[PDB]
Amino acid sequence: ALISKKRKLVADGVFYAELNEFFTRELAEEGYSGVEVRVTPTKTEVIIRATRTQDV
Amino acid sequence: AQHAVILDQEKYDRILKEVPTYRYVSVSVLVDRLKIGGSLARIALRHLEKEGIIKPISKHSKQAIYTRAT
Amino acid sequence: FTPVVLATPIPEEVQQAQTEIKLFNKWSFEEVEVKDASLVDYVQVRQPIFVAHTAGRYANKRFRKAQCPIIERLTNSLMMNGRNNGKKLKAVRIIKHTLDIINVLTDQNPIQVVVDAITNTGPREDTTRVGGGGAARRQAVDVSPLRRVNQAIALLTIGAREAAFRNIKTIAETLAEELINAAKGSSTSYAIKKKDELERVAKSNR
Amino acid sequence: QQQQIIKIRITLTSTKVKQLENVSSNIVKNAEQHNLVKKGPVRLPTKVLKISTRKTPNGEGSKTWETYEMRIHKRYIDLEAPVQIVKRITQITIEPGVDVEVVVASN
Amino acid sequence: SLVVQEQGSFQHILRLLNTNVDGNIKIVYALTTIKGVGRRYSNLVCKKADVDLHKRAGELTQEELERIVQIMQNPTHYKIPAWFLNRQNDITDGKDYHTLANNVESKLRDDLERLKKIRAHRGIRHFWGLRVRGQHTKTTGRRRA
Amino acid sequence: PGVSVRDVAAQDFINAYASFLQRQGKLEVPGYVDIVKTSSGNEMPPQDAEGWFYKRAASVARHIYMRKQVGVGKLNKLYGGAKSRGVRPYKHIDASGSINRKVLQALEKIGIVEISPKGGRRISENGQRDLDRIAAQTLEEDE
Amino acid sequence: TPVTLAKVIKVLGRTGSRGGVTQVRVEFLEDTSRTIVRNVKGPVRENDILVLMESEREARRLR
Amino acid sequence: GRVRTKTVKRASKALIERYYPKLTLDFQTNKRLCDEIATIQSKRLRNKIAGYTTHLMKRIQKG
Amino acid sequence: AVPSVQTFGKKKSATAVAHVKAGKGLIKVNGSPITLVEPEILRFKVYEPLLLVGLDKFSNIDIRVRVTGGGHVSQVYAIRQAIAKGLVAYHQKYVDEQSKNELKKAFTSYDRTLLIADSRRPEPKKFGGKGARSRFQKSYR
RNA sequence: CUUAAUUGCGAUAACGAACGAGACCUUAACCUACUAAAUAGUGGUGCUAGCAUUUGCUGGUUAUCCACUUCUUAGAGGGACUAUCGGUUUCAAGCCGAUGGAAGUUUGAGGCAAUAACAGGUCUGUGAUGCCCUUAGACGUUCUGGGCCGCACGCGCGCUACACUGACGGAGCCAGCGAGUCUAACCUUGGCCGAGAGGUCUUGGUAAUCUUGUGAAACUCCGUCGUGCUGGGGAUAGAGCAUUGUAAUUAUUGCUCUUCAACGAGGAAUUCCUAGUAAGCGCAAGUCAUCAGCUUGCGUUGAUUACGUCCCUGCCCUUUGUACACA
Questions:
Q1: Residues 1-60 of chain G sitting with CB below 7 angstroms of strand J
Q2: Taken in order D81, D87, D88, D90, is the CA torsion positive or negative?
Q3: Domain assignment of residue H1, yes or no
Q4: How many domains does chain F have?
């Protein structure tokens, strides 16, 4: 459906790349270490687990 | 040509005596046999071909051995 | 004798020379015997090749380049110099194309084709350069169990091609009278020239 | 309407060798406990994703070459997907990277 | 290389418009020698001219050579579709021209001396002499210049 | 013994079948005969004044029993030798485009032509109406 | 011929200031209780022929 | 280029730790040793441990 | 009918899938007669593992394989594995071991790489060079 | 004393250790075994058309029934460990000569590779980094384009030939690596137009379907010539045709015809390389709107001379000498 399989199953890998800076680029003082990797359809479950889950 | 390649026209009996007890001869030989050369090397196998002295014992492209048949 | 029911029928004159004993199909490469001088045990005939495409590793362990078949060695040894590098499947028709000219001239089927060449036209020797210094007088270091075959075959098929270019003479048809002139020849080919210049060192200087 | 099955190609996009087998076997057991006749799992073959690059950030030095690969493992199943497998994805057995698309082909 | 009884009626070495003819070579190389005459219409001097082709070049006799004068002068009377031509729509009237042996450089420099005087970019690289049609001329200048 | 045309030669076959029928009579020389170089980079046309029509058209008829279907885009991409390609190494680029398409006007009279849906060629048994019937006499002539 | 057939029973290796020439022994085929130190080319295996060319002479130092 | 390893120190301490009167020329227990005594980190660990313990246990039947 | 038989051959580009059906002696690559093997030179390397137990061994079986790919010889001695695995695939099981030691001793002394699954491969080319071991030019200046 | 190895045998003011080497992981090194293949297809298949009259060939009936993997497969394991016998050797490490082989370079090639550094080089992958002219003259952005290609004359990496395995046309049409369409667009078969480049009617596939068996060369098979700057060579130059883009002028290119340059195996010097390898050919990907003579990856035939030396360059390790330590 307008997005192929072989050439864009690596396209989800930007959501290991765009995302794993987006958590900690303004927030480099946060303390991120790799959350329990998780997904549901239509929406993504979000849990924080870091040094600074309190001040921000 | 200059020296025994094309016809050598006066010597038309030489094609008619093509093996002078001389077994090994091909297209690859006739050029310096003082006879027809690789231009017109086949006109000894055009002239005496079908039933006579000459019978085909070779195959390969452009180059064909021939022999006084036993 | 024993045809078969099918839709692709079979000729008659050939494979009864094959179904009886494990030898050649139409030509009599059969029970003729060897003229074995020195170089004892260099016959890969029985069990031979028919053409030279036998599968098997042969070259990195140098003690078993002698079990590369002795009939294949003259086929191994022709085509150089920017013209025929690759195209070694031209050397598979050469086999029957020099088992073409050998048929008009001294058949001597392959128990006699290669065993007659190294005797009276090639080395029984080598003359390699470990030559002391200044002007290298070469040690005339004679026959090894691998020095009867390699340069004795794979350079005499090369120096005898030197009239197969710039004019008419074909590589497949230069081989008309060089094997026989390696069998018995007075150098209408390249027989003497690898025992001419290397033997003036080798006779009495050692 | 209900439990006449509509011949849906069970399949599951991943990349690993036995982590898909952790999740594809959540159908492989769940299609055969109630025992359908099966001519099933087709290993989608391994695909490489070569990228060539010079190892250096500046083109000085020995221009040495470093290469790149992946292995796309996937399985698709030539069976009937029952009703107890088709929306089971939407609240359990789903994982980032494991985006279980289920293509359709029957006749 | 057909059945041949080549007597002295065969044409030997003679000038046939500035070429001493190689008669003994094939009939494809009977004429294909002059500037203006490339090897490309060695077929289309004798393609459908009803002359036999497997013979060598003793044929196309002294007055069957007359057609050779006018077949290459007039390119259209023998019905080539004019894609086999070297200069059309030149400067003056916009039609076809087959530039013959005198007319090789007779007209190309008229298109050059068209342009020595009209200021253009390919003008100042010919009478100076310079590689005008796309060559870097720094490293050109070593063994070729 | 039961004959297939897959039990028949295809090398000297055209030398003995499609050149046995060399003068069937219907010439089909549509104006672009022997004036075109017949391959898009190959500098020479056939200079023999004999053949190369059954060598291109009638090659296909027993070629297509050995397979399912072909077309002219597999005829141009079939026969290209070394190209007259500059001071640069050579390739295999395609043959002529509109010239070898003459079989799509030459074969039309035979009946070995059948045009199929799902593109391409269909071969009816009209090839068996001039080759499987000659599989009774010209296969026993090549002993 | 001044040549004699000779088994090279024991192998040594080879020598030289370039790599080619070889230390070997000979044990003959005719006229035993006689042996002379000789040389050979190269890739020699065990107990095989050395046809000479010299009659009875020597060549030892291998630089 | 055929010499020992750094896990030939422990290919001879646990070899005879309780396990001399087995492992003859028979190759079967020359792996069915090494799935029990060793937890296999490579199928080659049969090739690196038991690749010598028959020739080394040729040295025990000598003296 | 009978499920296909997993006696099986491999090579560079010519997978010699040694199928066997109830046949009558067709020597093909599913399409070509015995006179049409014919490169005039490479005629017999297809056969000669055939012509070893007799002439036919064709009473119940044929040689049914088909092959895509190939070089110039690389099918000729590829399916000769399949022509050797297309004979003896059932003579192990149905007829007995003394018909293998005293009658398939034909199939012992003429193994010129027949049941050998291949073990000689050209290596992948390196980096930093055209050739497989050849390298570029240095020109130390 | 061996080894590719400070890897190992052992002799020992050394004992135990720990990296580096080997192990480690891919990929070419296989399986008469199954949970599986209409994102390949075999056997009979419902069978048909001819021929031959012997379930013998082509094609399908997107399910006629299937047994469904035995080609891509791993879900994991196994099998070759110089193995095995003679020669060696301190009787140990070892190392050769024959055998058996899917399987006897370290399974072949790679995958990050230690201690310590190098004024190696990137503020040109960044609006990381103290340093100015900074801005309104600006040593930068918008844009018309130059210029990065400019040439007196040098030096490298590569391409084509230097000349009868030279050049030319047709029957078999064979690979292998991979690549491929989104809110518009790549791969494009089949058919008409055009001689080519291509124009157009169409088709399949967001992926073992389809382009593709990438129907490659080189070859398999034949007909043609004649050694001369030949029809070797296609530089150079002229004139026409279609495309890519908004536009090709300094020709981005591909095609047609004409013109047919030098040279005739290169001096002092110098690059690479011990078997599927050199050396000839060719295919896909990169940058790609257009452009491959270059690189990344891959096939097709398969030689020479060497399976050893420190001679020239280099390189580690001892003994030695040193007024040297930016060595």
A1: 11, 13-20, 41-43, 45-46
A2: positive
A3: no
A4: 1
